[PDB]
Design a protein around this ligand. Structure first.
Ligand SMILES: O=P(O)(O)C(F)(F)c1cccc(-c2cccc(C3CCCCC3)c2O)c1
Length: 284
């Protein structure tokens, strides 16, 4: 409740199923949630224009990812349009939501991957929408870190890249999930590929073992599709643990961390479609 009054609506199975199919109640609920957008005058940094895809979609200062190398005291070098996002039960830094890298922020994005020890990146972008292609065909170096694409795995809904990151003697692995099945119309029949991605990523996150480093999630602005992916991921754990889903409370938690998380009402309804489907799958 730090930045605005959180709201809650605890849904058991029947209400969840019915709520996903009630666009009139969904829009009434959705448009009562504060966007929690940052006033652009909150940042007064020369050269900042080149770091933002959109001038009104800025990272909330309290949860902003600061790039501490090579100069934490330089407001521009330290800047990236990204926020730490709490996971299920308020766990700190489960995710980082960021905008899709642009030409001038490609190297900044890799500085963030390196700083945070990110083991997983989730990219939600259509092949037609091509975010700047920030990974190499085979190999590239950015600020002392050699990035190598070791393997490309093509599945129906995502391209998985197994990437190696090397700097001096230390080597780290990274899994890059490029999801290509984001739908134009957020109808219930388009929910299974997103649910499959959510489940595949949470299993890969568990395989990292204790205190998994932040998972980076991005789409064009880093709020809409990113908000849907993260909200779904949190609610899948809530459903398995508690037997209920609270998409409203989860959306508020996301907005406190980054303004605008779950951008449209159609995206809000889509999360309900995904969660209603997962509840039916779990029931078996
Ligand atoms: O499901 P999707 O394709 O992502 C969608 F939500 F439908 C959708 C459709 C069309 C545009 C955007 C969008 C994406 C990034 C930034 C913005 C800005 C918001 C603030 C003002 C400037 C534009 C967008 O409007 C999202």
């Amino acid at each position: 409740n730090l930045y605005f009054q959180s709201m809650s609506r605890v849904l058991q199975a029947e209400e969840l199923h019915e709520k996903a199919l009630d666009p009139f109640l969904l829009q009434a609920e959705f448009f009562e949630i504060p966007m929690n957008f940052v006033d652009p005058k909150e940042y007064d940094i020369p050269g900042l224009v080149r770091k933002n895809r959109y001038k009104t979609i800025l990272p909330n200062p309290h949860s902003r990812v600061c790039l501490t190398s090579p100069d934490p005291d330089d407001p521009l070098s330290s800047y990236i349009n990204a926020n730490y996002i709490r996971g299920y039960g308020g766990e700190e830094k489960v995710y980082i939501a960021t905008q899709g890298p642009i030409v001038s922020t490609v190297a900044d994005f890799w500085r963030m991957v390196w700083q945070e020890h990110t083991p997983i990146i989730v990219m939600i972008t259509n092949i037609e929408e091509m975010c700047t292609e920030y990974w190499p065909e085979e190999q590239v170096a950015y600020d002392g870190v050699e990035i190598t694409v070791q393997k490309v795995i093509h599945t129906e809904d995502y391209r998985l890249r197994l990437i190696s990151l090397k700097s001096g003697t230390e080597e780290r692995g990274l899994k890059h999930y490029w999801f290509t099945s984001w739908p134009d119309q957020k109808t219930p029949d388009r929910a299974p590929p997103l649910l499959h991605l959510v489940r595949e990523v949470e299993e890969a996150a568990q395989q990292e073992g204790p205190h998994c480093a932040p998972i980076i999630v991005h789409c064009s602005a880093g709020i809409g599709r990113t908000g849907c992916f993260i909200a779904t991921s949190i609610c899948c754990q809530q459903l398995r643990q508690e037997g209920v889903v609270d998409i409203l409370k989860t959306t508020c938690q996301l907005r406190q961390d980054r303004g605008g998380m779950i951008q449209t009402c159609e995206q809000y309804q889509f999360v309900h479609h995904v969660m209603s489907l997962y509840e039916k799958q779990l029931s078996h």
